């Protein structure tokens, strides 16, 4: 009885294996864009992935990773709200069943078709597990998905996936460039917050693009024929791998733009 996405191991059961799930700094969350505050001594976020190696794709049994190397600085995100240095180790999606839902954050309470998570750790820790552990431990950038125009950056991913099909399933998945999955711009909201998945650990510096990217409904419907299940079991398609949005509490959330 590990933890899903079902009725009976979704998010609403989590906090009986991880209490922090009811914590004080828990991710996803709701962005009010008329209660989000431009804060002027926030800067320029620096996204430096030219030199990124991606390694592998895997099939988690709840979304999909792309991996990288990490064992260098090559891919890094710098600026914005961060201190020092974070390393980019992995992406990956939530998403939907039908293209009114997949996003874990929400603006006004709209939720688009899904969300790209661009995962990376604070290299003053030295590696990420101990990264983790820490307050400002890893970066998340966000990126949402809205269905219209296909993203040429994301074929690539769109194209292996028939490979990775069942949980356990991985894939050579060198030479992919991450930079072909951003918006033109790097207008972003923060808040302080956590992992969405257990262990839901309270570590991460969430950056959220306001420009959600176009993907096309023949992408998304890609993503939609994954499977959570092993190979031999009975098929699960992996849809609605979100977590919904959390309360806010004791934080703001900032905006980069005026
Ligand atoms: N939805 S979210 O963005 O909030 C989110 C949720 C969970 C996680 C942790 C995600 N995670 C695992 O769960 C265990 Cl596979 C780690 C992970 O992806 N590791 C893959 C990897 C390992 C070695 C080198 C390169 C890549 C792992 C462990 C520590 C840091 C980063 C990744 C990350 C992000
Ligand atoms: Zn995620």
Same mark, same amino acid.
């Given at each position: 009885?590990?933890?899903?996405?079902?009725?009976?191991?979704?998010?609403?059961?989590?906090?009986?294996?991880?209490?922090?799930?009811?914590?004080?700094?828990?991710?996803?969350?709701?962005?009010?864009?008329?209660?989000?505050?431009?804060?002027?001594?926030?800067?320029?976020?620096?996204?430096?992935?030219?030199?990124?190696?991606?390694?592998?794709?895997?099939?988690?049994?709840?979304?999909?990773?792309?991996?990288?190397?990490?064992?260098?600085?090559?891919?890094?995100?710098?600026?914005?709200?961060?201190?020092?240095?974070?390393?980019?180790?992995?992406?990956?999606?939530?998403?939907?069943?039908?293209?009114?839902?997949?996003?874990?954050?929400?603006?006004?309470?709209?939720?688009?078709?899904?969300?790209?998570?661009?995962?990376?750790?604070?290299?003053?820790?030295?590696?990420? @597990?101990?990264?983790?552990?820490? *307050?400002?431990?890893?970066? +998340?950038?966000? &990126?949402? !998905? =809205?269905?219209?125009?296909?993203?040429?950056?994301?074929?690539?991913?769109?194209?292996?996936?028939?490979?990775?099909?069942?949980?356990?399933?991985?894939?050579?998945?060198?030479?992919?460039?991450?930079?072909?999955?951003?918006?033109?711009?790097?207008?972003?909201?923060?808040?302080? @917050?956590?992992?969405?998945?257990? *262990?839901?650990?309270?570590? +991460?510096?969430? &950056?959220? !693009? =306001?420009?959600?990217?176009?993907?096309?409904?023949?992408?998304?419907?890609?993503?939609?024929?994954?499977?959570?299940?092993?190979?031999?079991?009975?098929?699960?398609?992996?849809?609605?791998?979100?977590?919904?949005?959390?309360?806010?509490?004791?934080?703001?959330?900032?905006?980069?733009?005026?």
């Amino acid at each position: 009885h590990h933890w899903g996405y079902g009725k009976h191991n979704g998010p609403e059961h989590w906090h009986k294996d991880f209490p922090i799930a009811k914590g004080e700094r828990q991710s996803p969350v709701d962005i009010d864009t008329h209660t989000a505050k431009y804060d002027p001594s926030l800067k320029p976020l620096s996204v430096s992935y030219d030199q990124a190696t991606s390694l592998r794709i895997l099939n988690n049994g709840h979304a999909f990773n792309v991996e990288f190397d990490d064992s260098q600085d090559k891919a890094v995100l710098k600026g914005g709200p961060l201190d020092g240095t974070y390393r980019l180790i992995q992406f990956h999606f939530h998403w939907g069943s039908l293209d009114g839902q997949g996003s874990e954050h929400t603006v006004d309470k709209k939720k688009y078709a899904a969300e790209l998570h661009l995962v990376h750790w604070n290299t003053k820790y030295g590696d990420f @597990g101990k990264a983790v552990q820490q *307050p400002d431990g890893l970066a +998340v950038l966000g &990126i949402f !998905l =809205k269905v219209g125009s296909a993203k040429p950056g994301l074929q690539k991913v769109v194209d292996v996936l028939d490979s990775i099909k069942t949980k356990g399933k991985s894939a050579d998945f060198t030479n992919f460039d991450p930079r072909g999955l951003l918006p033109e711009s790097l207008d972003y909201w923060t808040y302080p @917050g956590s992992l969405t998945t257990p *262990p839901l650990l309270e570590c +991460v510096t969430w &950056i959220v !693009l =306001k420009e959600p990217i176009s993907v096309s409904s023949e992408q998304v419907l890609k993503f939609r024929k994954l499977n959570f299940n092993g190979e031999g079991e009975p098929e699960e398609l992996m849809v609605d791998n979100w977590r919904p949005a959390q309360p806010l509490k004791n934080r703001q959330i900032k905006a980069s733009f005026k």
